[PDB]
Automatic annotation (TrEMBL), chain A:
HAMAP family: Ribosomal_uL23_B (MF_01369_B). GO terms for biological process: translation. Part of the 50S ribosomal subunit. Contacts protein L29, and trigger factor when it is bound to the ribosome. Keywords: Ribonucleoprotein, Ribosomal protein, RNA-binding, rRNA-binding. It holds the Pfam family Ribosomal_L23. It comes from Enterococcus faecalis. This is Large ribosomal subunit protein uL23. GO terms for molecular function: rRNA binding; structural constituent of ribosome. It comes from the Bacteria. Belongs to the universal ribosomal protein uL23 family. One of the early assembly proteins it binds 23S rRNA. One of the proteins that surrounds the polypeptide exit tunnel on the outside of the ribosome. Forms the main docking site for trigger factor binding to the ribosome. One of its GO terms (cellular component) is ribonucleoprotein complex. The lineage of its organism: Bacteria, Bacillati, Bacillota, Bacilli, Lactobacillales.
From TrEMBL, chain B:
Belongs to the bacterial ribosomal protein bL34 family. Keywords: Ribonucleoprotein, Ribosomal protein. Coiled coil: none annotated. Pfam families: Ribosomal_L34 (PF00468). It comes from Enterococcus faecalis. One of its GO terms (biological process) is translation. The gene is rpmH. GO terms for cellular component: ribonucleoprotein complex; ribosome. The lineage of its organism: Bacteria, Bacillati, Bacillota, Bacilli, Lactobacillales. This is Large ribosomal subunit protein bL34. Residues 1-44 are annotated as: Disordered. One of its GO terms (molecular function) is structural constituent of ribosome.
UniProtKB/TrEMBL annotation, chain C:
Mg(2+) binds at residue 52. GO terms for biological process: cytoplasmic translation. The keyword tRNA-binding does not apply. The gene is rplB. GO terms for cellular component: large ribosomal subunit. Belongs to the universal ribosomal protein uL2 family. The lineage of its organism: Bacteria, Bacillati, Bacillota, Bacilli, Lactobacillales. This is Large ribosomal subunit protein uL2. Residues 36-47 have a biased composition (Polar residues). HAMAP family: Ribosomal_uL2_B. Residues 41-117 form the Large ribosomal subunit protein uL2 RNA-binding domain. InterPro entries: NA-bd_OB-fold (IPR012340), Rib_uL2_dom2 (IPR014722), Ribosomal_uL2 (IPR002171), Ribosomal_uL2_bac/org-type (IPR005880), Ribosomal_uL2_C (IPR022669), Ribosomal_uL2_CS (IPR022671), Ribosomal_uL2_dom3 (IPR014726), Ribosomal_uL2_RNA-bd_dom (IPR022666). Keywords: Metal-binding, Ribonucleoprotein, Ribosomal protein, RNA-binding, rRNA-binding.
Amino acid sequence: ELLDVIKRPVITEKSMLAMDEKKYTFEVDTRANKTLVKQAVESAFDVKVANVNILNVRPKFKRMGKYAGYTKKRRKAIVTLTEDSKEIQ
Amino acid sequence: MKRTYQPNKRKRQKVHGFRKRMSTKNGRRVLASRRRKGRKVISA
Amino acid sequence: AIKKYKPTTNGRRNMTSSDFAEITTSTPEKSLLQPLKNNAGRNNNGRITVRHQGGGHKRQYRVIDFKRNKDNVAAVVKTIEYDPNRSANIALVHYEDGVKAYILAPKGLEVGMRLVSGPEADIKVGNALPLENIPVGTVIHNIEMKPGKGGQLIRSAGTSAQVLGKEGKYVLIRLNSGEVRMILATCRATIGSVGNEQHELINIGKAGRSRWMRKRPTVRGSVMNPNDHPHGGGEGKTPIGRKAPVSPWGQPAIGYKTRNKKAKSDKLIVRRRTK
RNA sequence: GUAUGAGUAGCGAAAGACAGGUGAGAAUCCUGUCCACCGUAUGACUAAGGUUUCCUGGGGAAGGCUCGUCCGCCCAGGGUUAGUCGGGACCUAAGCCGAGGCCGAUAGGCGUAGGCGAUGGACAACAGGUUGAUAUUCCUGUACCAGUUGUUUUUGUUUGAGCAAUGGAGGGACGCAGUAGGCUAAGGAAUGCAUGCGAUUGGAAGUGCAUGUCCAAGCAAUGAGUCUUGAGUAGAGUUAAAUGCUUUACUCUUUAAGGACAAGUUGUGACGGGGAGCGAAAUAGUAGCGAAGUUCCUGACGUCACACUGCCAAGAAAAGCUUCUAGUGAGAAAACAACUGCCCGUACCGUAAACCGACACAGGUAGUCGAGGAGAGUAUCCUAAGGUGAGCGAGCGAACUCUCGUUAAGGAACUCGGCAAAAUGACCCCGUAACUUCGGGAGAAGGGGUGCUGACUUCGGUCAGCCGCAGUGAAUAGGCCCAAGCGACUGUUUAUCAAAAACACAGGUCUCUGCAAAAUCGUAAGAUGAAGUAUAGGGGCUGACGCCUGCCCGGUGCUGGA
């Protein structure tokens, strides 16, 4: 299962900035340590070290028809490189 | 002056909790009664 | 002796307190302390059993020696002290082997003495003999009950007990409070009466001081409401209407005896006189 | 569901005005100017608690005590980065769970070993910059902890290598009160800096206005100062050992020497950063560029530090740590270089419109910082940094109710009762009765002075002069005396109609109880009394202190009797 840690990349006004210092942002599935994501990226993209960062998120609400329901959790992943690029987006 | 329902997080889970209601022979009566009525939140 | 504070403010009028004019140091031994708690009169159930307890300063327990079994090694006293638990001071002793422990303070002990506690010591203050080889007429203390248990009889300040006479079995004794009995001849004891002798002559003076020692106020009886104490009720100041003044559960208080009529000691008691 | 009361009562303390925007529409939104309010807080940071209220762009159906282009509201997008910070992968207190186990109609009760449990212990990062929102987390620079690899320096696992116990120890390790000393912070007043010179009479200034007046952790050096006597000898002991530790007996040693500790200071860190202002090319005061770092005075219960002296009410535990041996048991130290470091919290409000009170409520909310002038001061009056102008208004200036100000002559005639108001109130000086438990009454009573200028000031103050009706000129700031009852006093009491003469209280006295003590909770095991032992522990009445405390045992209890 060391390929379904990373889920997809975050594309935001903020994230787009970090693209200008070799810093990328993915959604990592919950229950994954840092080192796991290190391994996953290195083994999926031919890139390197410069320790990752990680987060957590709360849910929110929504009101459609008297229907109050939350949304999923999250876990961002903000990765830093040393020498190579990702011309993948 | 001071009114009653001064809320906390530890106490409300170490009095009306779950494990503190699965630790007796009476808490289980309470739980099963809350399950028979068809309740959502069995115990806070 | 006893100080007599000069009357400055009413809650200081006629207080009294010791001098502490023999206590040498003010720093206990480290390896003799043990912690404690202030039960405030409460069971494992968590209820009052005895009223009027709890709520004062802190105390840390001092493990006094009570059996006095090390024999044929001289014991040297070095310092007296103060103790918060009992009502009598305490001495620290060094044995030649390099071990420490405490002793109660007999009335007349001083630093620099040397003590022995064998079955063939000499009879001078401080020594701890077996009850047999203590001659007639002396005044001894820390008396045991069951051989090997330690001391449990006379233990507090300013108290005496003569030895009236031996038998083949057992030894007689005139206890304090003037009542005779007999205890097995193979019990340990030390000689001489206990120490601070005026500790009864202290007029406390304030109410916050008897509250420093862990006491607590104790309402009269005849004030409470009838549903809470048999004396109470009655509109006005009332006399005890019921005969035989009572405690809050029965048991008249004045005149009533309370031994256990089938006790296992009446064979060993001669002339209960003062109770 | 809809009426009456009725278009009535209310719109929940505090100051706004104008100009121009914006827009279908404006007192109520934005911008500008002047004004005004708080400022030991209406200011800054945090712990709970709340749970997306935070930010960006749209909207005006409902909430907003009116209005509303606006909002803590509706719609859409987006924000919370850690080896070092708080917690876990460390230790334990109260308390709880408790393998076996001891009791009990069932249910179950209680408890050993072992554990769980921060409000406590112990432990490796600092300064500046960066955004619309995050910052000991991102970035820059300088560090630190513990480990892993690679070339870089001593071999009988005996242990002369090294390592090193679940054992032997040392340590961690602890109260309150009172002043005294040493530093830094903070504060104040004159030097250095850059700038401009008043349109109201006047004024290029040693002595004139406005304005700024500096910087880490770590590393290296030192150090106001604080604590402590130290050595040998023959012994015991430390369940086996000990070169570690306790201890005895003796001989020398004492302002000494040795050891232990220490706020701080100087350089470096630093060509870095910050800074009054100056300041573009445009959507920008933005990008960018910048002075100087002085002397003297007052100076912390912040720090050395529970350091010292005194007192009695006699003042947590365990791990981390240092050692020693028993000990399995090649050859690990240190070069330098380069790497590895897990999970959880991080938005926002937080004396409040976001918490507790049904509310956008005149109530409640633990901790740190908390400036200037006078001033003992966190008091009072006005103010700095900083924040606010409170969610209905425009008029008129009647009765009446509430909150305030003033009064002729009289001064308790009112009244159940001087309730309420009025009167005194600061600092310095003179002086002060009966009575007494000799400490007190005592701030008893009753009186006098205070402003400004000059001279002399021995030092404090004294002289001379000037003005007002009034000189602590405003705010803050005891009314007193003569007798009686009750209660000795400081305390405590009916949350929400009674705060006393009620209870407590120190002292008095009777009585019980010899330790598996009496007594109490429980059917019992088990507990408290107590790790106490008659100078102790429970029960009943009385309530400082002084002088005292008479008569009756026939009746009712209690104890003794045979």
